Amino acid sequence: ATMLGMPKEFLWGLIPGITKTDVEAMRQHFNDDDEMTQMLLWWTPNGPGGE
Amino acid sequence: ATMLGMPKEFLWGLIPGITKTDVEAMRQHFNDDDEMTQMLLWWTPNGPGGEFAAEIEVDSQTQIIEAQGDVQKDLQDAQAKAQADLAKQNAAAQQRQAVAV
């Protein structure tokens, strides 16, 4: 994903331990407006980032 | 891909675990306009990048510029009031010393 620029969404299904139902759940709730979800989405190593 | 500059699309098919149908699916949905797809396409290690981080940056800089403009505006208003009162008092003193005869 970092070098060849593959779409990460397609690479989610190839990771062991994650099923396609979990992939769909991640897809539906990727950009939720909850504060926790937003902080996790913009999580820098030194705490939350973004807005 | 990094050093020899090979086309990455041709190198997708050589990676084990990815078939040519999956390669075609990646090709067709590479530049989708969905927010999730765009965030994944511009994914920096510290969260999404691209226009998503640009919006945050411009909002922050605009807020800072607006605050600086507000303080400059109040400074200019104070300067204008000071100049107005100074001119008024100077004119009053000049006319007061002129009337005396």
Place this chain on the structure above:
Amino acid sequence: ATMLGMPKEFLWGLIPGITKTDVEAMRQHFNDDDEMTQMLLWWTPNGPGGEFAAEIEVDSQTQIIEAQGDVQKDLQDAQAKAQADLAKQNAAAQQRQAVAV
């Protein structure tokens, strides 16, 4: 390629898993105008680069410059109004003290 500066195109054929037909296909479709091909050609680790990141950068800087110009414009309007009223009051005071006779 990085140190001795060998031509990378000649080194593509020596990499196992890539045939000369694939090398020709890479040669013909290296600089395609497709958005996906251009993004892959300018792929930085933190998402696409090249003109795609340049557009984001120029949009951000243009928005910041526009906000700064807006605050400067309102400051200039306030300064112009202050100068206008100061000149008006100065002329009024001068004519008022001149009429007195």
